[PDB]
Amino acid sequence: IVEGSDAEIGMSPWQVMLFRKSPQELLCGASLISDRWVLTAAHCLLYPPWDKNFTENDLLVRIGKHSRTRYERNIEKISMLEKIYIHPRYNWRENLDRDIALMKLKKPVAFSDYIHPVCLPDRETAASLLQAGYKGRVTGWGNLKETGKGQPSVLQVVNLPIVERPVCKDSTRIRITDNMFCAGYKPDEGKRGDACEGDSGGPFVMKSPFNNRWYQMGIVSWGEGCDRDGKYGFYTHVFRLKKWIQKVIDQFGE
């Protein structure tokens, strides 16, 4: 996260860290959407151009963490994965269309002050909140700059506005799709912030004024550099893909 700030303890209790088992390595962010399902980006699991093709046997998650340099006794929880599910029409070869994956925990996690699921959007919330200029919130342990420090100890948080699709489209020569949206400040708005390398798979959330619940509207997916003027971060559009999400959970919930 670039130009963010330290999270407060328990500020993002759905935050999940995805690790490679061996060698142990933090790969990606992720989010807790029930006591046994974790949402992340497909490219965190499958990206052939980088020779990446992880199965559930290769990975684990850590849940409830705030600071990644000390074990947080009686707070953090560690879980293996029973199965992973990648969107069947995920497009790694060009534009990361449908960059979404689900991971089933090997055993359900108990909720606590530090571990609690985020909501997925319903039709009402998506229609009401997914508007240009409305702000959401991105969290992660990724790079503090595009290019001494580099990686933060404590979870980073930044609030960023959703951007109009024509501005997103004009900002990049990549062919973008309706399954992604972009967010970030415009060059004339005099504020900054972005996700960056290592934040992918983490959540873009919004707080509903209608019921005071936090909803996950996006997944950190890609960008061109980080926090550049006239560039924006791109996020998987969670609600667009919710029928696939529900199909996997409904069919494989056991």
Binding site: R89, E94, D199
Partner: peptide, 24 residues
């Protein structure tokens, strides 16, 4: 407002002249 895809179909073969997105 929901993504639709055919059960059988495939992701499009990328235009070799088109730039590709780099994941975060």
């Amino acid at each position: 407002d929901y993504d639709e895809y055919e059960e059988d179909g495939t992701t499009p073969t990328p235009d070799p002249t088109a730039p590709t997105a780099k994941p975060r």
